[PDB]
């Protein structure tokens, strides 16, 4: 029946389920009550002036699945979308954060991608980030959600907003077909691949790009880590440096990003986070995106790397470059200092 | 007579049909119950423990005994939830 | 679909005829609703205000609105009552 069709889509939680990810700084609330949270939130938004402190305190303190529970209980009581309430109730950088926290990981990345590709000049960095960083599983969920929301393939949007070997590189990566190379180590292949990167690379006048795309999209991370090392027995420059000498533009931007993620991903974000705060003022768009998307994945390692390299903790840097509940939100998302 | 009384009586015979003249629901008789009535519902869910681990949350399973009170308590959640959904997102 | 499925479904959309397109159950079309459903019930009850007597105390009864949760509370009281006399008497 159509009672079975609705019956197919549901379940409940409270021990559920098992996405721990110790590398996340955001853990589900212990004693969680979705209804009582939706309640207080509704109470907080109706307060003249908008008690923010409550809303921020609750949402940055609940896990993503929890937020999803909270948001549904809210539409149940109020007959209105929580996402729409907060977009009205909040403003500035704090709104951008809470609204990003209110999305599923896939939905967030999907919406971020769409935002970048709107227009002639894309917002280029953000596209590259997600793409280069996301795993095969993360990426295919982005492909699902992106279709559901925008009634189009993500591939086609990339094709419209990109040209040349850039488009080539982005379409290939976004396919999320990379290998896993779990146990057996392929030494000739490692060596073969190193030689190819060199042969299409520094060795040759100009560059043979698709050759680089194939290896760096297809091969597994581990295999590439080892490839990038063996690479050095061929070229005077390491992989990162060769890219700078071989190519330029957004192609260069992309390959550089992709290589770091493969080599060390948490360090990659650590660096991007440092870069977002280092000058006069800050780049908030990048700072928020990372803090929202890595909060449940690698944040603990990003922290480790961030301190090892820069000497001071991510927490310290957030305090210093952000003030207000916006800051407190980032800090909750960060989880503590090192 | 009424499709509604059709509905209520179905529930009434159903609970006893599985519970036996033992009279009460084990997580086992529960599991076979939901599996026969809503096939495709359970294994579409991540936690297989869901049925097994559910009984803690029910009206009273504290002896492992699902009353008709507790069996109705179960359906309550499903029947509410479905309605929420399809009137929210449907037609 | 198993019987329980379309029975639960009937429980769902039978509430949707008389809830209006408003979403809340008025007292009046509550009267009409309950009337539509049961053949051997409202005639047996002598009190002419009987439906209105039922309206109060029922989950949330205080505003003139009865949600699906509350109507389902009617079903809870009623259908549990039935089963009891099924057990201590019929069974």
């Amino acid at each position: 029946s159509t009672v079975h069709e609705i019956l197919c889509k549901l379940s409940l939680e409270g021990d559920h389920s098992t996405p721990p990810s110790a590398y996340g700084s955001v853990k589900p609330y212990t004693n969680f009550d979705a209804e009582r949270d939706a309640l207080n939130i509704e109470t907080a938004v109706k307060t003249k002036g908008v008690d923010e402190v409550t809303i921020v305190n609750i949402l940055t303190n609940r896990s993503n699945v929890q937020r999803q529970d909270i948001a549904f209980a809210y539409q149940r009581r109020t007959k209105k979308e929580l996402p729409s309430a907060l977009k009205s109730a909040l403003s500035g950088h704090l709104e951008t954060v809470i609204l990003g926290l209110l999305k599923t990981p896939a939905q967030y990345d999907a919406s971020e991608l769409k935002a970048s590709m709107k227009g002639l000049g894309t917002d280029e960095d953000s596209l590259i980030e997600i793409i280069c960083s996301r795993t095969n599983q993360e990426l295919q969920e982005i492909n699902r959600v992106y279709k559901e929301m925008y009634k189009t393939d993500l591939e086609k949007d990339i094709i419209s907003d990109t040209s040349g070997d850039f488009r080539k590189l982005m379409v290939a990566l976004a396919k999320g077909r990379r290998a896993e190379d779990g146990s057996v180590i392929d030494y000739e292949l490692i060596d073969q691949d190193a030689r190819e990167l060199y042969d299409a690379g520094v060795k040759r006048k100009g560059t043979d790009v698709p050759k680089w795309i194939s290896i760096m999209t297809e091969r597994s991370v581990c295999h590439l880590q080892k490839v990038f090392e063996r690479y050095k027995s061929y070229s005077p420059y390491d992989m990162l440096e060769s890219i700078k000498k071989e190519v330029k533009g957004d192609l260069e931007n992309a390959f550089l990003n992709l290589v770091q993620c493969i080599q060390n991903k948490p360090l990659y974000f650590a660096d991007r986070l440092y870069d977002s705060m280092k000058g006069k003022g800050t780049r908030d768009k990048v700072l928020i995106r990372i803090m929202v998307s890595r909060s449940e994945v690698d944040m603990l390692k990003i922290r480790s790397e961030f301190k090892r390299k820069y000497g001071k903790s991510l927490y310290y840097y957030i305090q210093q470059d952000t003030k207000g509940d916006y800051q407190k939100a980032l800090l909750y998302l960060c989880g503590g200092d090192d | 007579p009424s499709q509604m009384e059709h509905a209520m009586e179905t529930m009434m015979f159903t609970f006893h049909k599985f519970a036996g003249d033992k009279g009460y629901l084990t997580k086992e008789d529960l599991r076979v119950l939901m599996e026969k009535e809503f096939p495709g519902f359970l294994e579409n869910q991540k936690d297989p423990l869901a049925v097994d681990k559910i009984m803690k949350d029910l009206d009273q399973c504290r002896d492992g005994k699902v009353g008709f009170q507790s069996f109705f308590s179960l359906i309550a959640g499903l029947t509410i939830a479905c309605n929420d959904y399809f009137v929210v997102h449907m037609k | 679909p198993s019987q329980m499925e379309h029975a639960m479904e009937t429980m769902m959309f039978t509430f949707h005829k008389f809830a209006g397109d408003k979403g809340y159950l008025t007292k009046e079309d509550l009267r009409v609703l309950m009337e539509k459903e049961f053949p051997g019930f409202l005639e047996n009850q002598k009190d002419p205000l009987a439906v209105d007597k039922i309206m109060k105390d029922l989950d949330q009864c205080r505003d003139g609105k009865v949600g699906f949760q509350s109507f389902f509370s009617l079903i809870a009281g009623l259908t549990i009552a039935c089963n009891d006399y099924f057990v201590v008497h019929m069974k």
Partner: peptide, 9 residues
């Protein structure tokens, strides 16, 4: 006190 769980999605 029918006390019961509800479900989401």
């Amino acid at each position: 006190p029918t006390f019961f769980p509800r479900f989401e999605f």
